[PDB]
């Protein structure tokens, strides 16, 4: 039966729309949005052909770990922002909502079994990350935030919620 709270589209959607507004607003950034350093972020691309063919448990691995990296990226962005009298007045609330939203999503995902599945499906040695994407502006940070939640996160959540008993 619907794995509770996150399986309610409207509940998850609240955050996706927040992220959209964050991403949308950071498009008018200009030169007032540098993070003044490269903040590592997760990869948000989803190849639907490969995505639907991989062990479903791997969807869990990708989303849970990706979200964790994302939280760290946003947290770092928050502290980088607390420092300085730098520009962009809009940034603050979007970051506070992101830190707040990511925290809720993390709790929401775990209840979905994401953390459990991700740790087991990932308990064997594998190949080096071999990737490492980063951002040096709040614009890319927020665009990644939106693409991740509206992307593989939404995708993973959609499939995982369809779980009765068989």
């Amino acid at each position: 039966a619907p794995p509770r709270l996150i399986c309610d589209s409207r509940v998850l959607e609240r955050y996706l729309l927040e992220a959209k507004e964050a991403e949308k607003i950071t498009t008018g950034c200009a030169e007032h949005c540098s993070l003044n350093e490269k903040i590592t972020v997760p990869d948000t691309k989803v190849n639907f052909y490969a995505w639907k063919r991989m062990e479903v448990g791997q969807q869990a691995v990708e989303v849970w770990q990706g979200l964790a990296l994302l939280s760290e990226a946003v947290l770092r962005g928050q502290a980088l922002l607390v420092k300085s009298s730098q520009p962009w007045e809009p940034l603050q609330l979007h970051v506070d909502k992101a830190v707040s939203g990511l925290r809720s999503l993390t709790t929401l995902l775990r209840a979905l079994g994401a953390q459990k599945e991700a740790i087991s499906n990932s308990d064997a040695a594998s190949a080096a990350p071999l990737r490492t994407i980063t951002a040096d502006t709040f614009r890319k940070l927020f665009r990644v935030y939106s693409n991740f939640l509206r992307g593989k996160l939404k995708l993973y959540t959609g499939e995982a919620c369809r779980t009765g008993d068989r």
């Binding site: 409207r10 609240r14 928050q78 830190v99 925290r103 809720s104 709790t107």
Partner: protein, 213 residues
Amino acid sequence: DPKFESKAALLAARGPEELLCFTERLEDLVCFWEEAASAGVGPGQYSFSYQLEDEPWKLCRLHQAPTARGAVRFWCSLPTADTSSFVPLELRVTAASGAPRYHRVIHINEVVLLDAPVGLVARLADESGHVVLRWLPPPETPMTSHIRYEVDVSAGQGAGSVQRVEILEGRTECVLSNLRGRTRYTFAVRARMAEPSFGGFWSEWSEPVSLLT
């Protein structure tokens, strides 16, 4: 802060003189308690600490205020970054001596006190003669799909003594088809989050609207 003052009054009533907390737009949270006005040592009298599950214990600068009753209310507004729904929030208030005064564990999504619905209008239906009630949800509020309502309908020959109709969450319309003819009615709506995903307390009633049948 009228709205906050009047809301903290509702909780003082319905709930305990204990530590009361409530969110209005799901991106905020204020906790408070009233107490027999003392002397000096106001906000300093106590230390308000909180901890969202799995994170470090934080402090929340307290504020003191003259409750329009004759007492003093101490309140703290949580930093927005910490107003996460669906995550256990442990609160603790300690008196100057170091003794605990209040200890609660809440879920922000379960203590919502919404602003009242706005724009209540009543029209006579399309050739049915029924009364169609339309209104707007609390302004600047998310999760409107999860906001259910309650309509109060009163009127009659100096006999207007209400009736309450429960409205489905997300729905901002109400059809009344059993109202007495040639009668001036008065309606109003109040809002509250729907369980089990959310919880809270009834909002203030919306400005009323009168209609003659």
